[PDB]
Amino acid sequence: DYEIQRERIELGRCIGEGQFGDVHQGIYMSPENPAMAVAIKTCKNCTSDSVREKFLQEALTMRQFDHPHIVKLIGVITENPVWIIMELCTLGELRSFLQVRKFSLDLASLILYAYQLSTALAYLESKRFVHRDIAARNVLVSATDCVKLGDFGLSRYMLPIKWMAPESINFRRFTSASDVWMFGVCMWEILMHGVKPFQGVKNNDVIGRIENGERLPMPPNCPPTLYSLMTKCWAYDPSRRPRFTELKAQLSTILEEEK
Numbered sequence: 001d002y003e004i005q006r007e008r009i010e011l012g013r014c015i016g017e018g019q020f021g022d023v024h025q026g027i028y029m030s031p032e033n034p035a036m037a038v039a040i041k042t043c044k045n046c047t048s049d050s051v052r053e054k055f056l057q058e059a060l061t062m063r064q065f066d067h068p069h070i071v072k073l074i075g076v077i078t079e080n081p082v083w084i085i086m087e088l089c090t091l092g093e094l095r096s097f098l099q100v101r102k103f104s105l106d107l108a109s110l111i112l113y114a115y116q117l118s119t120a121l122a123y124l125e126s127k128r129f130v131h132r133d134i135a136a137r138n139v140l141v142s143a144t145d146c147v148k149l150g151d152f153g154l155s156r157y158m159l160p161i162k163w164m165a166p167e168s169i170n171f172r173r174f175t176s177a178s179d180v181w182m183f184g185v186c187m188w189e190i191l192m193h194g195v196k197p198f199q200g201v202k203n204n205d206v207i208g209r210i211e212n213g214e215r216l217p218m219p220p221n222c223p224p225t226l227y228s229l230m231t232k233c234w235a236y237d238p239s240r241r242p243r244f245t246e247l248k249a250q251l252s253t254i255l256e257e258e259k
């Protein structure tokens with residue numbers, strides 16, 4: 001039973017927003033237990049059964065996954081106003097975190113984040129789930145040594161041209177291999193401490209550059225084998241890209257090498 005009593009939830013400050021309404025941090029309380037920190041998605045004008053159904057489908061999406069590096073569904077409140085209660089990552093967005101902690105994070109930590117995310121994405125691959133929104137903006141920080149894929153509903157779109165595989169841009173095709181492309185971009189962002197890809201470049205010129213063979217450059221202090229793995233994710237032909245299963249394996253070795 002995923003239904004939660006409203007009085008068990010204490011609403012705190014807003015930590016952002018999505019399509020349906022504001023997102024809040026807060027507390028989930030239960031007798032005999034410590035107060036559990038939670039994120040709370042709200043719906044301005046739920047009830048209206050179409051809108052309420054769409055909003056709640058996002059909870060159902062998260063329900064089917066059980067992984068250490070993907071935010072977990074805690075529960076729902078199906079009465080008005082309708083809330084979805086999620087596991088809180090207390091340190092926020094990965095981009096901000098990397099930008100501020102730049103002189104306090106070593107290379108091992110950054111590779112650790114890439115590795116952790118790859119395990120989440122290999123997990124999704126095995127369930128045949130296509131994310132479509134893999135970007136550093138959608139990764140959350142649970143602890144200095146732990147990151148997680150954020151809510152899938154809240155991850156939705158920015159078309160994220162600068163993150164997208166050519167076949168996704170050209171033919172609206174979205175597969176695990178297009179996800180791999182995006183993950184390659186996400187690793188580059190991590191190594192760059194949260195600098196955005198194709199800075200200063202118009203979206204329309206981006207496809208022209210990829211088609212001309214241009215790729216994002218090797219980040220300073222990124223190890224060669226890791227940049228080599230990144231460029232494989234950016235193979236123009238999707239069938240030449242490694243699967244997340246292979247990425248996990250190779251990121252494991254690269255990480256160990258670095259430690």
Ligand SMILES: CNC(=O)c1ccccc1Nc1ncnc(Nc2cc(OC)c(OC)c(OC)c2)n1
Nearest residue numbers: 015016023039087088089092093138150151154155
């Ligand atoms: C992919 N983005 C999300 O899932 C998301 C976006 C906006 C707000 C909350 C989101 N989801 C979420 N899920 C679990 N934990 C968190 N934690 C979190 C997220 C934050 O910013 C996105 C925070 O800074 C404002 C923050 O500081 C306390 C915590 N967010």
